[PDB]
Amino acid sequence: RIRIRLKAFDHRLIDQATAEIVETAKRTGAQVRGPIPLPTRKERFTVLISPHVNKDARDQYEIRTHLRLVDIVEPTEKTVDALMRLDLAAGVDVQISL
């Protein structure tokens, strides 16, 4: 019913955020399917290095956007509304949707 997606750049911080989410969700209710890995975005950049000429000198960078998904079909609403607003999500992006 209620599907929650979390975005971050680090792999373990998202894991601990998902662990907190699932622990609080199971404490306040039930019917948790656990986090879903889903693909991880790899934003790749390349930049010239020298401030003048030297075309061959290049540096490769990449940003790992990690994404997690967890859904709950709990009937009671007084548990989900209480679960919200009490969690900091370990200071990374999280979205609430139906």
Binding site: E43, F45, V47, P51, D59, Q60, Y61, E62, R64
Partner: protein, 61 residues
């Protein structure tokens, strides 16, 4: 065309996106710019290597 509607070009031709260059924000360079970080090759790297830009890491795939 439809009437003299086209002729209404009395504008200073500045609002058009074509007029904006989208240079760097710290120093200003016409070249070596990217939209994501909004800076330019050189500056970007300084920030990435100093560890300012979050989630930026060396690529060794």
């Amino acid at each position: 065309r439809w009437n003299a509607v086209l002729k209404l070009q009395t504008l200073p031709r500045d609002s058009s996106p074509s007029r904006q260059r989208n240079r760097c924000r710290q120093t200003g360079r016409p070249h070596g710019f990217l939209r994501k970080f909004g800076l330019s090759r050189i500056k970007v790297r300084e920030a990435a290597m100093r560890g300012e830009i979050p989630g930026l890491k060396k690529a060794s795939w």
